[PDB]
Design a protein around this ligand. Structure first.
Ligand code: NA
Ligand code: NA
Length: 435
């Protein structure tokens, strides 16, 4: 019971209590008494755990506080955490209202929508509270189920509407609700029957201890397209440019090292900011309006010294090769120097390279490339690709050439991809000696 809280008045010096059908302030604050335990629930109602009822007052026309069945409409059961204090002070003839035991205001523990998994409600969130077999529930329950799985109604009256779904769980395994890749031990959840917005889908994955699908490897694309063959669907993935336009990122902060945009994508930069995978294109990526309602896919996984003319940063040595060469020839020159084309794994390393090594050189080669397999970028030095810093609407050279290599471009230190044909200076990286 982490969302539950007591309501204290400094002006009356006591906690708000609900007895029978009445509401009072008692100086005897006791966090154990459910009569004093409150909880925000759906549709801006304030729920009491002792009475299993909702705080209410009269509509304009008859003013007092009382407890009422939460589905009563003949009374106003709606409150706002910002004005609740003023309403309580008004109706009790009081000062300042806070959560008991803290300096936090009554807006500190807000109601969060919990989106359902599978069931028959297309991902619609739990209606809190809901009635089932004439009993109120202010949370998920397994009563009425043998397997013990937690569920909830998506209307307030299950007996009437029979709309429901499974509740999301934060698990250390991937048992009931997930397809697991045995090779990578990564778990995937295709909610074909749900219809949620991107942000809603994001929240759903998050409250399962997961994130929207990121596709980081060529294999991962193949495994994903695999499970999708036969189905006909368009599903949200973690891809978006909400922060920076054209700056596509995975919601789970994975590097944008693999790409599978459809031929004409992405487009409509002014309206479409979120990524979808499609079965029609055999797993191609599109960008769409983030507010549209779609099925979605979740994912979870249960001080050195340098040689002369080189400069140190962290544990490596860096050097500018000012002579303009091709990407491959730039690399060959780095190797003869006992190093390789620079690999960049953090923002601090990037800043060092850009401010200290590149300086006013306009554009130059780094180690990132997709010569081996196209649309799948890797560092020439074989290092793990953990970090990308693409310019807006980059990369995009796989859209023409069959071989793409990467440069640092301009003062921000962001990256382009380009034909390796191009003649540019470059930066080299090798390990340093400690010291
Ligand atoms: Na589009
Ligand atoms: Na490019």
């Amino acid at each position: 019971e982490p969302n539950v809280f007591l309501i204290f008045s400094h002006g009356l010096q006591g906690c708000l209590e609900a007895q029978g059908g009445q509401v009072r302030v008692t100086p005897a604050c006791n966090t154990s008494l459910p009569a004093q335990r409150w909880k925000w629930v759906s549709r801006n109602r304030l729920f009491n755990l002792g009475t299993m009822q909702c705080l209410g007052t009269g509509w304009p026309g008859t003013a007092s506080l009382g407890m009422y069945e939460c589905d009563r409409e003949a009374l106003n059961l709606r409150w706002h955490c910002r004005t609740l204090g003023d309403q309580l002070s008004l109706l009790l003839g009081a000062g300042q209202w806070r959560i008991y035991g803290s300096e936090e205001d009554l807006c500190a523990l807000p109601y969060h929508e919990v989106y359902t998994i599978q069931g028959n409600s297309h991902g619609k969130p739990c209606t809190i509270p809901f009635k089932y077999d004439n009993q109120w529930f202010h949370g998920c329950t397994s009563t009425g189920r043998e397997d013990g799985h937690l569920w909830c109604a998506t209307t307030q009256d299950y007996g009437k509407d029979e709309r429901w779904g499974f509740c999301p769980i934060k698990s250390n395994d991937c048992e009931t609700f997930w397809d697991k890749d045995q090779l990578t031990d990564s778990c995937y959840q295709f909610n074909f029957q749900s219809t949620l917005s991107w942000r809603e889908a994001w929240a759903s994955c998050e409250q399962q201890g997961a994130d929207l699908l990121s596709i980081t490897e060529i294999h991962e694309q193949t495994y994903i397209n695999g499970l999708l063959t036969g189905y006909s669907s368009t599903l949200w993935i973690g891809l978006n440019d909400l922060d920076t336009s054209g700056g596509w990122q995975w919601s789970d902060n994975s590097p944008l090292k693999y790409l599978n945009w459809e031929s004409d994508q992405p487009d409509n930069p002014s309206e479409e900011n979120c990524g979808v995978i499609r079965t029609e294109s055999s797993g191609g990526w599109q960008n769409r309006d983030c507010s549209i309602a779609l099925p979605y896919v979740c994912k979870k996984k249960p001080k050195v010294e340098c040689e002369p003319s080189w400069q140190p940063f962290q544990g490596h040595c860096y050097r500018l090769q000012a002579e303009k060469r091709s990407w491959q020839e730039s690399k060959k020159a780095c190797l003869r120097g006992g190093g390789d084309l620079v690999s960049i794994h953090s923002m601090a390393e990037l800043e060092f390279i850009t401010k200290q090594i590149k300086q006013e050189v306009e554009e130059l080669w780094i180690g990132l490339n997709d010569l081996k397999l196209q649309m799948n970028f890797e560092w020439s030095d074989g290092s793990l690709v953990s970090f990308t810093h693409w310019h807006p609407f980059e990369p995009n050279n796989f859209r023409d050439s069959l071989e793409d290599c990467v440069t640092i471009w301009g003062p921000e230190g962001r990256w382009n991809d380009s034909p390796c044909n191009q003649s540019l200076p470059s930066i080299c990286k090798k390990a340093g000696q400690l010291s």
